[PDB]
Structure 1
Amino acid sequence: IMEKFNASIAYDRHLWEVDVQGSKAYSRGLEKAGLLTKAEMDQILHGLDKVKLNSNDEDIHTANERRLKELIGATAGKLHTGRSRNDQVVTDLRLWMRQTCSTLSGLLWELIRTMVDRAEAERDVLFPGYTHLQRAQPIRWSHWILSHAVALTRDSERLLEVRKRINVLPLGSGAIAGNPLGVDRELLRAELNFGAITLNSMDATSERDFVAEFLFWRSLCMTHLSRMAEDLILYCTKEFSFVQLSDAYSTGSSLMPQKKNPDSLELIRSKAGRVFGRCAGLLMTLKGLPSTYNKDLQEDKEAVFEVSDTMSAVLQVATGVISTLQIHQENMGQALSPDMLATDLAYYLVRKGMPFRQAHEASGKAVFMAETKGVALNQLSLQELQTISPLFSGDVICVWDYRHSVEQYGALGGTARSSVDWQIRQVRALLQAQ
């Protein structure tokens, strides 16, 4: 069971197109040191672009040389001098990840692109804003769509910051101390197209902060998307009926088709901890490992392989739900109430030159009046409001306009059409410098 425990091939199959490319460079490195002749350098170089399985192999690194060694045979044995598994593999992984995050950053970018573009489009819809899940203030639909953009926007700032910490080159760090044969790291950083070489042989080998940061990230992006899905499956309630799901991104409901059953917005929510799970593990796996490269570290692979395949895929379903998303407008506009407008009478007298406690006591007196009058806030008489405060005049009429209350929240970052337009710029622009 042990060797079938040491066995890395099942999960690490993916490093093929990375194992050959990382070698072709180190091939070019040794010859520059004069360890290989052009003629033989060009021998194992082609093989690694001339390159079934076998039971005796442990890892993908094996699978290759074990193959390389037939077609070439001679040169093959030497190809791998000075560069051990431990430095070979981190090169084999920084490389895959750095390609996979380029991908990851693009998918996430479309999600933010898809939301911001839609926000512009649905800008004028009204619906309610909740606090402790209870109707509090009329606020715009794009203002909701936008808070999931801005927050998803941060994730790509993060993932762009990690993109650069992954781009380091460790190759040539040997096993504990560096490369004995002297081969220059610089050539290895140019060919592999990485940002720069690493300034220490024991860290490049024993450290996996690059995967740790990536899992911190993922677990945070999901915390973000599991909230987007908590909001949506709640807005998708027969009770609420704000948004209706696409019958392609929705589960089969029969004999009672009124039950437009979610699922996509549930699978997105489950992953929150399945992604966090691996991070919660990868950090404990290395809680206090003594020295340079312990075997413990074989966990780096399976983990970034699962969390990245969950992420690249989920983000696509998330964009796939926001764009299809069909909203029931009337339902949303009928979801408002003058009870939320009560706080707005306080803001009126404030502009007419009155203090707040007082201003909001008049609102309180306006509530109690309709209560006992029985007929609500819209049903209140002008002279009546002139009783509560003479400051009250003809312009109280406009305070009963839900969209007026919304265009009352200005000053950059508010929910006025003006401010939503400003946000739709800032995110798009933020993305433009990404």
Structure 2
Amino acid sequence: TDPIMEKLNSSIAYDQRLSEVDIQGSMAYAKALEKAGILTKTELEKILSGLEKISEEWSKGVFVVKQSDEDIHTANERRLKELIGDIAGKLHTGRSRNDQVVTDLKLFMKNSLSIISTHLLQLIKTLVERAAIEIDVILPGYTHLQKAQPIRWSQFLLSHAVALTRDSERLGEVKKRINVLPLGSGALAGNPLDIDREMLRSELEFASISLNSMDAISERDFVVEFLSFATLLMIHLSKMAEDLIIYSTSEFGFLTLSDAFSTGASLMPQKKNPDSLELIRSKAGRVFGRLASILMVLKGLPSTYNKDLQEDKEAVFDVVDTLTAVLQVATGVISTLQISKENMEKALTPEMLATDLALYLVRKGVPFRQAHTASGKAVHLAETKGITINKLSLEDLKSISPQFSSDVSQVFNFVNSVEQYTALGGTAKSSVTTQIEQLRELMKKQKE
């Protein structure tokens, strides 16, 4: 026996995290075994009693792993034998580590996903609640990281909330396919003892049962799917982080993170580094790496079970802990950051209203092309005079288009600017208000 081979093959170091679900799966299997008459009533009692002790050992942190333990399945089996004797061996009857390992992982994932959902909905709720409070705040909207047009700060917050809501929906879709029992698939051909799979389903609380035994022990669709959901969520978080890091620069000055989510030097007490957001942004790569690895692991693999499949667990574990930490830090950052209403409003410039000046002519019937040419001229005329467009005289304006009336004065108002956007989904207050309502309802349906 080669020690390097043994260490490489062995999965106990990390798969012991599945200790509890593994016992849960065995208890369920033991009850079906009895029903199938493989075990006597008394034998069942003994088995279940022993399994409960083991759950407790792991639970209290007293379980002692042994050098011989290849995986969590062998470890639990070894300890039950130690606790109740020979009778423990009837438990693996008609059972394979192949369907046992995917049953364990799916039960762990269903529980993990339930937790991730709570944190994801909390992040969304936090953004939506903040959008509701700061709905009167206006700042520049950007394209190419250049000032485009005024937008409400809440529109920006809600843009991230909406995208995250789609991540929550995908999470639900992933959870559905994970909530399918694979136990009773045996090594690849199914269970040979006509085990009551419906009974196993009910006991382990799965929603339905796997359709084909070969597919059940061979596929890791649920792992890839979860990693795809995870990666896109991180993409969203990498973008929100990017936005917030830039807005927190001294140059932008739109906001400041709380002390808990930033770092800084006593020599420059006014400066705060957004470490929280940089950690979050870098995890998009950490999680994407996991998705890439499993995809490459599964590609070109022959049916059915192959040891290549063992690489699934460490990837799922890393991403579950990554998502759980990242979502809570994101929530914290969003709920505690402080905005500078003053600097956001200060960033609004008259130049950003030339588009609105053109729209003014459009609403009066001037064709789009000529309205844009007119505004461009007003902008040019102001520039030649060394003044801003909101300062041009009505006479100056008419020298370019008699269509400009004294009411053109209303164009140079940033509230009036964002208020143009009443069509559904836009930045006008009535629209932002509607979005908050839709999101509250969406979160409700998702939580449910």
Q: Same fold (TM over 0.5)?
A: yes
Do residues 124 (structure 1) and 136 (structure 2) align? yes
Q: Is the 8 A contact 1:346 1:359 kept in 2?
A: yes
Cα offsets for 1:140-182 (capped at 9, x unmatched): 1001100000000000000110011100101011112111111
**What is the match of residue 396 of structure 1?**
408
Deviation at 1:364, TM superposition (A): 1.4
| Structure 2: stretches of 5+ with no match in the other structure | 55-63
Q: Which deviates more, 319-328 or 345-354?
A: 345-354
**What is the match of residue 88 of structure 2?**
76
Cα offsets for 1:312-336 (capped at 9, x unmatched): 1111100110000101111110001
Do residues 33 (structure 1) and 39 (structure 2) align? no
Deviation at 1:95, TM superposition (A): 0.5
**What is the match of residue 126 of structure 2?**
114
Do residues 290 (structure 1) and 293 (structure 2) align? no
**What is the match of residue 443 of structure 2?**
431
Q: Which deviates more, 141-150 or 36-45?
A: 36-45
- Match for 1:10: what amino acid? A
Do residues 16 (structure 1) and 16 (structure 2) align? no
**How high is the TM-score relative to the length of structure 1?**
0.98
Cα offsets for 1:230-285 (capped at 9, x unmatched): 11110011111111111111102231223211100100011111100011110101
Counterpart selection for 1:278 from 282, 290, 293: 290
- Match for 1:9: what amino acid? I
Match of 1:239, SS state, is coil
Do residues 148 (structure 1) and 160 (structure 2) align? yes
**What is the match of residue 133 of structure 1?**
145
Counterpart selection for 1:209 from 212, 221, 239: 221
Distance across 1 between alignment mates of 2:342 and 2:232: 35
- Match for 2:272: what amino acid? K
Deviation at 1:38, TM superposition (A): 1.0
Do residues 319 (structure 1) and 331 (structure 2) align? yes
- Match for 1:64: what amino acid? N
Match of 1:411, SS state, is coil
Cα offsets for 1:360-409 (capped at 9, x unmatched): 11111211211122221121112222332222212111111011000011
After superposition, where does 1:34-433 map in structure 2 within 5 Å?
Answer: 34-51=37-54, 52-433=64-445
Report percent identity of matched pairs: 72
- Match for 2:290: what amino acid? R
- Match for 1:257: what amino acid? P
- Match for 2:314: what amino acid? E
- Match for 2:76: what amino acid? N
Cα offsets for 1:101-123 (capped at 9, x unmatched): 01111110000011001100001
Deviation at 1:53, TM superposition (A): 2.3
**What is the match of residue 5 of structure 2?**
2
Cα offsets for 1:182-234 (capped at 9, x unmatched): 11111111111101111101010111000010111111111110111111110
Q: Which deviates more, 362-371 or 412-421?
A: 362-371
- Match for 1:187: what amino acid? M
Q: Which of structure 1's runs of 4+ aligned residues deviate more than 4 A? A: none
- Match for 1:265: what amino acid? L
Q: Which deviates more, 369-378 or 101-110?
A: 369-378
Deviation at 1:353, TM superposition (A): 2.0
- Match for 1:137: what amino acid? Q
- Match for 1:20: what amino acid? I
Q: Which deviates more, 41-50 or 158-167?
A: 41-50
Distance across 1 between alignment mates of 2:53 and 2:379: 82
Distance across 1 between alignment mates of 2:18 and 2:125: 31
Q: Which deviates more, 164-173 or 249-258?
A: 249-258
Q: Is the 8 A contact 1:253 1:261 kept in 2?
A: no
Distance across 2 between alignment mates of 1:375 and 1:44: 87
Q: Is the 8 A contact 1:47 1:71 kept in 2?
A: yes
- Match for 1:430: what amino acid? L
Deviation at 1:340, TM superposition (A): 0.7
Q: Is the 8 A contact 1:86 1:205 kept in 2?
A: yes
Distance across 1 between alignment mates of 2:135 and 2:119: 24
- Match for 2:121: what amino acid? W
Cα offsets for 1:85-141 (capped at 9, x unmatched): 111111111110011001111110000011001100001101101101111101110
- Match for 2:425: what amino acid? G
Cα offsets for 1:54-106 (capped at 9, x unmatched): 21111111111111112211320111111111111111111100110011111
Q: Which deviates more, 53-62 or 132-141?
A: 53-62
Q: Is the 8 A contact 1:107 1:315 kept in 2?
A: yes
Distance across 2 between alignment mates of 1:396 and 1:291: 72
- Match for 1:25: what amino acid? A
Which structure's residues are more often helix, by fraction?
A: 2
Distance across 1 between alignment mates of 2:225 and 2:172: 12
Match of 1:2, SS state, is helix
| Structure 1: stretches of 5+ with no match in the other structure | none
Match of 1:128, SS state, is strand
Q: Is the 8 A contact 1:162 1:213 kept in 2?
A: yes
